[PDB]
Coordinates of C-alpha atoms in Angstrom, one line a residue:
Chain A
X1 CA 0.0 0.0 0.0
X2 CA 3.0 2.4 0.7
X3 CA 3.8 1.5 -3.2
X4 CA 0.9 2.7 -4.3
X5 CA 1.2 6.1 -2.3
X6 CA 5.0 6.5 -4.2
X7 CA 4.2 5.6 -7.5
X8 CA 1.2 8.3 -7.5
X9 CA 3.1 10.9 -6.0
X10 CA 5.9 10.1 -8.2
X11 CA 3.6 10.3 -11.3
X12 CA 1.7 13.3 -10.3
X13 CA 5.5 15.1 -9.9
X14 CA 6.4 13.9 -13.1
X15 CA 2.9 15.2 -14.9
X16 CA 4.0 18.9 -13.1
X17 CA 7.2 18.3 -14.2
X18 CA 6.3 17.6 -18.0
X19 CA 3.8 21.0 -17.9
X20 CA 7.0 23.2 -16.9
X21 CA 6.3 25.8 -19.8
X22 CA 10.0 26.2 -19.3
X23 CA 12.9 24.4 -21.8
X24 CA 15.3 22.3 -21.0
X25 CA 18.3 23.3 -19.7
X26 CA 21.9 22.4 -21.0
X27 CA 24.0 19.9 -18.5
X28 CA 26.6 22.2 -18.8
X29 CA 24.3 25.2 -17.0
X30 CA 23.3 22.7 -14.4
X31 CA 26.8 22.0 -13.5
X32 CA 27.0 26.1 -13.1
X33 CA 24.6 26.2 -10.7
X34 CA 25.6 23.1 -8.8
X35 CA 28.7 24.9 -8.7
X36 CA 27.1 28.4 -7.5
X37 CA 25.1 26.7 -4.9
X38 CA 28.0 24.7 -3.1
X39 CA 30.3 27.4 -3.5
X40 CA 27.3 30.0 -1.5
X41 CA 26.8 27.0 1.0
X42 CA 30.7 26.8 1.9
X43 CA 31.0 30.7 2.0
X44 CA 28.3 30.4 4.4
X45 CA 30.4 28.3 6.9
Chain B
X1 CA 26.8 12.3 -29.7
X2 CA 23.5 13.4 -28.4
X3 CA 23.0 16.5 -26.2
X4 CA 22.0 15.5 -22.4
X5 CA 19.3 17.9 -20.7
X6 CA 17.9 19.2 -17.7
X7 CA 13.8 20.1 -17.0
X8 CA 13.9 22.5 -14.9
X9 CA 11.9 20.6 -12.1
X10 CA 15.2 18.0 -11.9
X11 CA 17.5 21.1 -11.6
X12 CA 15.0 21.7 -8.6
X13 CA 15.1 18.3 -7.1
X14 CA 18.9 18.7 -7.6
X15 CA 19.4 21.8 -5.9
X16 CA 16.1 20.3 -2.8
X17 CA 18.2 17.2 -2.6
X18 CA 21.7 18.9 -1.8
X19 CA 20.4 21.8 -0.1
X20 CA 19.1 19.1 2.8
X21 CA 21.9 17.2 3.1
X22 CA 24.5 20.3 2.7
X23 CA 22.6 20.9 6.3
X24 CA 24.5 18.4 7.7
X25 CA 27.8 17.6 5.7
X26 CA 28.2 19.1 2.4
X27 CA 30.8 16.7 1.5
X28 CA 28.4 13.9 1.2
X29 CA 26.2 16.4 -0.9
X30 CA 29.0 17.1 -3.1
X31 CA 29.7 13.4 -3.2
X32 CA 26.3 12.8 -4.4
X33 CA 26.4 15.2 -7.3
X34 CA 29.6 14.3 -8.6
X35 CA 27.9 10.9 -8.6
X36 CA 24.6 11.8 -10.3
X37 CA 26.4 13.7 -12.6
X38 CA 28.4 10.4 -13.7
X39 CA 25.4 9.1 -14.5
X40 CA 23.9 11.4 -16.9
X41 CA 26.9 12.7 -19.0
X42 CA 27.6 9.2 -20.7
X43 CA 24.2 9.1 -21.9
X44 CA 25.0 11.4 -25.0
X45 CA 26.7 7.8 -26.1
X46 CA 24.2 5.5 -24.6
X47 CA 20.7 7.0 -24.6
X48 CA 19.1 3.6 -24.1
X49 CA 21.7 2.0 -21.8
X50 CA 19.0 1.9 -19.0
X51 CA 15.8 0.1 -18.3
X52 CA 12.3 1.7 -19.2
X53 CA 10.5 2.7 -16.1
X54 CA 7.7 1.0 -15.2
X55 CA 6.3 3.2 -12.5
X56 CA 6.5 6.4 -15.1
X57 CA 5.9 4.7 -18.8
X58 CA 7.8 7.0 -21.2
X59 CA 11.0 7.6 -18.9
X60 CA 14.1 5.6 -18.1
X61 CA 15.5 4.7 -14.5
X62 CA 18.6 5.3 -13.5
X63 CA 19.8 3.9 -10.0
X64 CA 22.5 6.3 -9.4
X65 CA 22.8 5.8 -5.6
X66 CA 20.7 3.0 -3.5
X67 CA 18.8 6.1 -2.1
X68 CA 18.3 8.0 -5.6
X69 CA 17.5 7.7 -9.1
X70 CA 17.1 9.6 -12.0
X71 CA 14.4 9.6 -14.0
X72 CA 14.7 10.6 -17.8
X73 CA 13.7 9.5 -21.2
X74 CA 15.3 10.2 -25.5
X75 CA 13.2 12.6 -26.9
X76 CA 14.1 12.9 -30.9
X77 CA 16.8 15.6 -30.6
X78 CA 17.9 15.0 -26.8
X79 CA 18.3 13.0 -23.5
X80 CA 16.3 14.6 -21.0
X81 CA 16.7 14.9 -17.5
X82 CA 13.0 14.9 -16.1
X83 CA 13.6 14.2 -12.4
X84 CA 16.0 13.1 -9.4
X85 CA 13.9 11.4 -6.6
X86 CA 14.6 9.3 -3.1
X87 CA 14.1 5.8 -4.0
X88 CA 12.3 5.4 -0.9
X89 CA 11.1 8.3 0.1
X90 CA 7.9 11.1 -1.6
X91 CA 11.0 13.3 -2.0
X92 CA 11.9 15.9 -3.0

């Protein structure tokens, strides 16, 4: 029964996440911003 | 070889994921990104190296980590990203 609970919650996030009106974003960019965030989190120590 | 992607909403479970564990120890949220990254930049050569999902029909599971996988599928110009999830938990 918890299966059932996961698999809708994992479809309903993947049905918000297919009507993002928003493209796709390079790897490349997503690497930048992993980047930006880790370097923020360490400046924050 | 064929250009990997990211939907926004996986950038966003990317940055949930690592934002929660950075709380704690940022080197085992850096650990896990270099890791999920290692997954999804080979797949410009093997698009269809992983299994079809059955939970999500359309999309392709990746089990990068025994407590995360990434979820994406080969559109006809791209790999796309569509979402990074706990493997046992509704998260993020």
């Amino acid at each position: 029964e918890q299966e059932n609970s996961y698999n809708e919650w994992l479809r309903a996030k993947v049905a918000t996440s297919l009507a993002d009106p928003r493209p796709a974003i390079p790897h490349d960019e997503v690497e930048r911003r992993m980047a930006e965030r880790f370097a923020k989190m360490r400046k924050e120590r | 070889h064929l250009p990997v992607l990211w939907l926004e909403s996986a950038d966003t479970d990317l940055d949930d994921i690592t934002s929660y564990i950075a709380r704690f120890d940022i080197d085992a949220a850096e650990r896990l990104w270099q890791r999920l990254r290692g997954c999804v930049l080979p797949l410009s050569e093997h698009p269809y190296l992983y299994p079809p999902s059955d939970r999500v029909p359309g999309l392709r599971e990746i089990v990068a980590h025994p407590n995360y996988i990434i979820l994406y599928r080969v559109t006809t110009s791209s790999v796309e990203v569509v979402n990074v999830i706990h493997a046992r938990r509704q998260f993020p």
